[PDB]
Amino acid sequence: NLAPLPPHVPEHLVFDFDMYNPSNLSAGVQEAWAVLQESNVPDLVWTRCNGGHWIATRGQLIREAYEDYRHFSSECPFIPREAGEAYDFIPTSMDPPEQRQFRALANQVVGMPVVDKLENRIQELACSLIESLRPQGQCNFTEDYAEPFPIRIFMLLAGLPEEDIPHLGYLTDQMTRPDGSMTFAEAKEALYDYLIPIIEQRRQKPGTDAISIVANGQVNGRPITSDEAKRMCGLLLVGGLDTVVNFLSFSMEFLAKSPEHRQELIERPERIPAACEELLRRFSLVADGRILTSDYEFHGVQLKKGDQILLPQMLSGLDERENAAPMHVDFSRQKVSHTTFGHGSHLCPGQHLARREIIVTLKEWLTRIPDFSIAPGAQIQHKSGIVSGVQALPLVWDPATTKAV
Ligand code: HEM
Numbered sequence: 001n002l003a004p005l006p007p008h009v010p011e012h013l014v015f016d017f018d019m020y021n022p023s024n025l026s027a028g029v030q031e032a033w034a035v036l037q038e039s040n041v042p043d044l045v046w047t048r049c050n051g052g053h054w055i056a057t058r059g060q061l062i063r064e065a066y067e068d069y070r071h072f073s074s075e076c077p078f079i080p081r082e083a084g085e086a087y088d089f090i091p092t093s094m095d096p097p098e099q100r101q102f103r104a105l106a107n108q109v110v111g112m113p114v115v116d117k118l119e120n121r122i123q124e125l126a127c128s129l130i131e132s133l134r135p136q137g138q139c140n141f142t143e144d145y146a147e148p149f150p151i152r153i154f155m156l157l158a159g160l161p162e163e164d165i166p167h168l169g170y171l172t173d174q175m176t177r178p179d180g181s182m183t184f185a186e187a188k189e190a191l192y193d194y195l196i197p198i199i200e201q202r203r204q205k206p207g208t209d210a211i212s213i214v215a216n217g218q219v220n221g222r223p224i225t226s227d228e229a230k231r232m233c234g235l236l237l238v239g240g241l242d243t244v245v246n247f248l249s250f251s252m253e254f255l256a257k258s259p260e261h262r263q264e265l266i267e268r269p270e271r272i273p274a275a276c277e278e279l280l281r282r283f284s285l286v287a288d289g290r291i292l293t294s295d296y297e298f299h300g301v302q303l304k305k306g307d308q309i310l311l312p313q314m315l316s317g318l319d320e321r322e323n324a325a326p327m328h329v330d331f332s333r334q335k336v337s338h339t340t341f342g343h344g345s346h347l348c349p350g351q352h353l354a355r356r357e358i359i360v361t362l363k364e365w366l367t368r369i370p371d372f373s374i375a376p377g378a379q380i381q382h383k384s385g386i387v388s389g390v391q392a393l394p395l396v397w398d399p400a401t402t403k404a405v
């Protein structure tokens with residue numbers, strides 16, 4: 001459904017892209033977003049979908065906008081406006097200078113010290129999961145590996161019972177790829193409602209887990225509050241449950257379709273980190289945005305105070321003006337340009353955990369199950385949203401071609 005074009009928005013710039021159901025979805029979700037970068041399309045368009053908002057279609061604009069928090073505020077970062085307005089997660093709903101004291105804390109609970117401490121656990125789980133599936137000669141990758149591998153590590157990191165995963169994952173899905181069953185507002189409130197007693201408990205009896213660290217944390221050297229803690233913990237939950245999960249599925253689908261790429265990594269495993277970066281570019285999956293703080297002309301376009309602008313992190317790296325042949329996966333790409341983990345002061349702090357989980361997955365899978373394919377006839381469907389994803393991924397393989405390692 002199309003919202004009436006506001007008086008200030010030039011009609012020639014109208015491109016009715018729907019970020020939650022793009023027209024060319026069947027071609028692939030990155031492919032469907034890439035329609036915004038065909039030859040006839042401007043750098044900055046207005047869609048009347050989802051309440052009406054701007055979309056920057058090119059990496060140069062996306063980067064510039066994320067650097068300029070003065071004009072492009074985090075305070076309303078989701079589309080539609082209702083979701084953006086209800087979105088009060090910490091730190092991402094705050095701009096500098098206010099954001100900063102909270103980000104230091106959030107950066108602590110997922111940073112490299114934490115990851116290295118988890119390295120053994122991550123290793124064991126991946127190998128455990130994969131070795132289980134190996135003689136079976138088949139799996140649904142989304143539920144057999146893509147979900148349980150990162151989620152179990154996160155739940156472990158957070159100190160939360162795995163029993164809760166189906167609920168918490170439903171809530172997170174609705175915030176990024178809504179069913180229609182919940183508003184972002186509703187799902188956010190439910191996640192907050194879950195966390196409240198848990199935070200009170202961790203404050204009374206301080207522990208070593210991510211939630212204890214936040215809940216007992218200090219900001220600017222002063223006591224974080226219960227409300228502040230809730231707002232920060234909920235966001236970590238979203239990060240921990242709905243990013244790597246989805247990226248893993250884009251990567252494995254591709255690897256399942258590309259024997260030559262799998263061979264590359266089988267023969268020269270030392271390339272796996274590079275392959276990781278390139279997959280992060282090619283199958284980049286996040287797209288949120290900002291809200292105009294005041295009337296502002298940006299690349300010859302008059303933006304009005306209150307306007308929302310989608311600034312798709314996904315698109316920077318698929319921009320042919322950043323990467324030649326951007327839809328080709330080249331593990332030896334010399335300059336792998338992307339903004340997959342964001343750009344500007346909100347740049348992802350969990351990226352180290354993401355890379356670790358990615359590289360470990362690539363390394364343990366190809367070592368044990370080097371030869372696999374998509375189940376015959378399966379027509380893989382993607383889903384689009386704040387964070388895009390893969391609906392289902394049935395893999396098959398011959399057990400006789402595997403290695404117990
Ligand atoms: C492939 C995996 C991931 C991708 C592609 C990704 C992407 C992003 C992007 C694009 C942003 C910026 C959002 C904005 O500017 O509005 C962001 C921020 C953030 N991410 Fe990641 N993320 C991933 C994994 C994770 C994980 C595993 C965690 C935590 C366990 C996490 C936690 C966070 C947090 C807390 C922020 C907010 C930082 C701030 O606002 O200062 N992310 N991420």
Ligand SMILES: CC1(C)[C@@H]2CC[C@@]1(C)C(=O)C2
Pocket residue numbers: 089092176235238239243286288386387
């Ligand atoms: C857009 C994000 C990936 C980033 C971390 C989780 C997420 C959904 C947010 O709300 C901020």
Ligand SMILES: [K+]
Pocket residue numbers: 005006007008009010011
């Ligand atoms: K107009």
Ligand SMILES: [K+]
Pocket residue numbers: 075076077084085086087088093
């Ligand atoms: K808000």
